[PDB]
Write a protein that holds these residues in place. Structure first.
Motif, mmCIF file in Angstrom:
data_model
loop_
_atom_site.group_PDB
_atom_site.id
_atom_site.type_symbol
_atom_site.label_atom_id
_atom_site.label_comp_id
_atom_site.label_asym_id
_atom_site.label_seq_id
_atom_site.Cartn_x
_atom_site.Cartn_y
_atom_site.Cartn_z
ATOM 1 N N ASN B 32 63.120 58.489 -5.670
ATOM 2 C CA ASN B 32 62.790 58.985 -6.997
ATOM 3 C C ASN B 32 61.706 60.055 -6.959
ATOM 4 O O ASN B 32 61.110 60.363 -7.996
ATOM 5 N N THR B 34 58.759 60.164 -4.859
ATOM 6 C CA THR B 34 57.566 59.808 -4.096
ATOM 7 C C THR B 34 57.915 59.177 -2.750
ATOM 8 O O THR B 34 57.539 59.701 -1.697
ATOM 9 N N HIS B 35 58.631 58.056 -2.770
ATOM 10 C CA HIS B 35 58.965 57.353 -1.541
ATOM 11 C C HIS B 35 60.383 56.808 -1.629
ATOM 12 O O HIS B 35 60.927 56.601 -2.718
ATOM 13 N N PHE B 37 64.059 54.630 -0.574
ATOM 14 C CA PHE B 37 64.594 53.277 -0.624
ATOM 15 C C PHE B 37 66.039 53.288 -0.148
ATOM 16 O O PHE B 37 66.723 54.313 -0.202
HETATM 17 C C1 LIG Z 1 59.298 55.672 -7.730
HETATM 18 O O1 LIG Z 1 59.542 54.275 -7.782
HETATM 19 C C2 LIG Z 1 58.526 53.490 -7.137
HETATM 20 C C3 LIG Z 1 58.976 52.052 -7.232
HETATM 21 O O2 LIG Z 1 58.545 51.457 -8.448
HETATM 22 C C4 LIG Z 1 57.162 53.735 -7.785
HETATM 23 O O3 LIG Z 1 56.171 53.090 -6.993
HETATM 24 C C5 LIG Z 1 55.331 52.260 -7.816
HETATM 25 O O4 LIG Z 1 54.132 52.948 -8.207
HETATM 26 C C6 LIG Z 1 53.251 52.172 -9.034
HETATM 27 C C7 LIG Z 1 52.104 53.077 -9.416
HETATM 28 O O5 LIG Z 1 52.561 54.386 -9.728
HETATM 29 C C8 LIG Z 1 52.806 50.917 -8.286
HETATM 30 O O6 LIG Z 1 51.994 50.120 -9.143
HETATM 31 C C9 LIG Z 1 50.775 49.744 -8.464
HETATM 32 O O7 LIG Z 1 51.045 48.826 -7.404
HETATM 33 C C10 LIG Z 1 49.887 48.403 -6.663
HETATM 34 C C11 LIG Z 1 50.367 47.560 -5.501
HETATM 35 O O8 LIG Z 1 51.585 46.931 -5.884
HETATM 36 C C12 LIG Z 1 48.960 47.636 -7.623
HETATM 37 O O9 LIG Z 1 47.799 47.217 -6.929
HETATM 38 C C13 LIG Z 1 48.572 48.546 -8.804
HETATM 39 O O10 LIG Z 1 47.741 47.836 -9.714
HETATM 40 C C14 LIG Z 1 49.809 49.128 -9.505
HETATM 41 O O11 LIG Z 1 50.433 48.055 -10.192
HETATM 42 C C15 LIG Z 1 54.025 50.123 -7.831
HETATM 43 O O12 LIG Z 1 53.625 49.013 -7.035
HETATM 44 C C16 LIG Z 1 54.968 51.008 -7.020
HETATM 45 N N1 LIG Z 1 56.158 50.267 -6.636
HETATM 46 C C17 LIG Z 1 56.490 50.032 -5.362
HETATM 47 C C18 LIG Z 1 57.749 49.247 -5.146
HETATM 48 O O13 LIG Z 1 55.804 50.433 -4.428
HETATM 49 C C19 LIG Z 1 56.850 55.225 -7.867
HETATM 50 O O14 LIG Z 1 55.682 55.441 -8.652
HETATM 51 C C20 LIG Z 1 58.016 55.991 -8.482
HETATM 52 N N2 LIG Z 1 57.750 57.420 -8.481
HETATM 53 C C21 LIG Z 1 58.073 58.221 -9.501
HETATM 54 C C22 LIG Z 1 57.727 59.670 -9.334
HETATM 55 O O15 LIG Z 1 58.622 57.796 -10.511
#
Ligand SMILES: *[C@@H]1O[C@H](CO)[C@@H](O[C@@H]2O[C@H](CO)[C@@H](O[C@@H]3O[C@H](CO)[C@@H](O)[C@H](O)[C@@H]3O)[C@H](O)[C@H]2NC(C)=O)[C@H](O)[C@H]1NC(C)=O
Ligand SMILES: *[C@@H]1O[C@H](CO)[C@@H](O[C@@H]2O[C@H](CO)[C@@H](O[C@@H]3O[C@H](CO)[C@@H](O)[C@H](O)[C@@H]3O)[C@H](O)[C@H]2NC(C)=O)[C@H](O)[C@H]1NC(C)=O
Ligand code: NAG
Lengths: 100, 96
Positions: B32, B34-35, B37
């Motif tokens: 999407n 950033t990273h 899958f």
């Molecule tokens: C593309 O999709 C991925 C998957 O959801 C997105 O990554 C997600 O990013 C958010 C923040 O932008 C992460 O939330 C944070 O997570 C950390 C550790 O879990 C937590 O300590 C924080 O309080 C916050 O909740 C989320 O975890 C992360 N998801 C994964 C599976 O890593 C990404 O942002 C998306 N990119 C775009 C451009 O849409």
């Protein structure tokens, strides 16, 4: 013969871009260089036979299509299955007009 | 069974991490922005990239589609709790 030629120009425009997914609901886009890696996977050989050899596989496909063009124009006996459709009907009427 | 509404993503046919190409066991890599899958073919269920569902075939300069990211292995969930645990406990004997 125009809208028949538009139906068969829409099957080729979906089996190239979408693949096989437009026969089961929504049509989903896919690159053609990646769809071919799924046709090999349904045969028994892995994906790496295509991606590691994308050069010579492409040239075999283009040359095979060009050989079809000369094969159709080589002789008129290739289309005998469709000619007998109109030949059987046309000579059936000529026998009927000489029953008089 | 009929699939419902969809959502588009960005793809790449292979992954190179340590100079060797990696191909997915089932599905193909999506992202999407950033990273990345790895996902099933008929249901959007993203999963992290791991050695358990990727197999290596040659080096990463033979196919046109290569992107750069990291690939994981199921031993650093263990060895980071093992090798670092083994390395830390052996440092207290070198001090005196
Ligand atoms: C593309 O999709 C991925 C998957 O959801 C997105 O990554 C997600 O990013 C958010 C923040 O932008 C992460 O939330 C944070 O997570 C950390 C550790 O879990 C937590 O300590 C924080 O309080 C916050 O909740 C989320 O975890 C992360 N998801 C994964 C599976 O890593 C990404 O942002 C998306 N990119 C775009 C451009 O849409
Ligand atoms: C993914 O990361 C690797 C690791 O950096 C990238 O490999 C790097 O590729 C560039 C160009 O493809 C190499 O630069 C080269 O430098 C030499 C010497 O100056 C020059 O003669 C070449 O014309 C070229 O510019 C670079 O050395 C190389 N890094 C290495 C080998 O450690 C790779 O390109 C990345 N992939 C993508 C898609 O970005
Ligand atoms: C090393 O051993 C000594 C034993 O006297 C102990 O006091 C100290 O806390 C130990 N240090 C670590 C990092 O385990």
């Amino acid at each position: 013969d125009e809208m028949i030629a538009q139906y068969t120009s829409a099957l080729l425009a979906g089996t190239i871009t979408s693949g096989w997914t437009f026969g089961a609901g929504p049509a989903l886009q896919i690159p053609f260089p990646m769809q071919m890696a799924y046709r090999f996977n349904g045969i028994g050989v892995t994906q790496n036979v295509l991606y590691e050899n994308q050069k010579l596989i492409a040239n075999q496909f283009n040359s095979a299509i060009g050989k079809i063009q000369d094969s159709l124009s080589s002789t008129p006996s290739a289309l005998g299955k469709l000619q007998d459709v109109v030949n059987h009907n046309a000579q059936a009427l000529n026998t009927l007009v000489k029953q008089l | 069974y009929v699939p419902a509404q969809e959502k588009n993503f960005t793809t790449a046919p292979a992954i190179c991490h340590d100079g060797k190409a990696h191909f997915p066991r089932e599905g193909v890599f999506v992202s999407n922005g950033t990273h990345w899958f790895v996902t099933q073919r008929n249901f959007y269920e993203p999963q992290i990239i791991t050695t358990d569902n990727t197999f290596v075939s040659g080096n990463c300069d033979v196919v046109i589609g290569i992107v750069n990211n990291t690939v994981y292995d199921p031993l650093q969930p263990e060895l980071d709790s093992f090798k670092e645990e083994l390395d830390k406990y052996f440092k207290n004997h070198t001090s005196p």
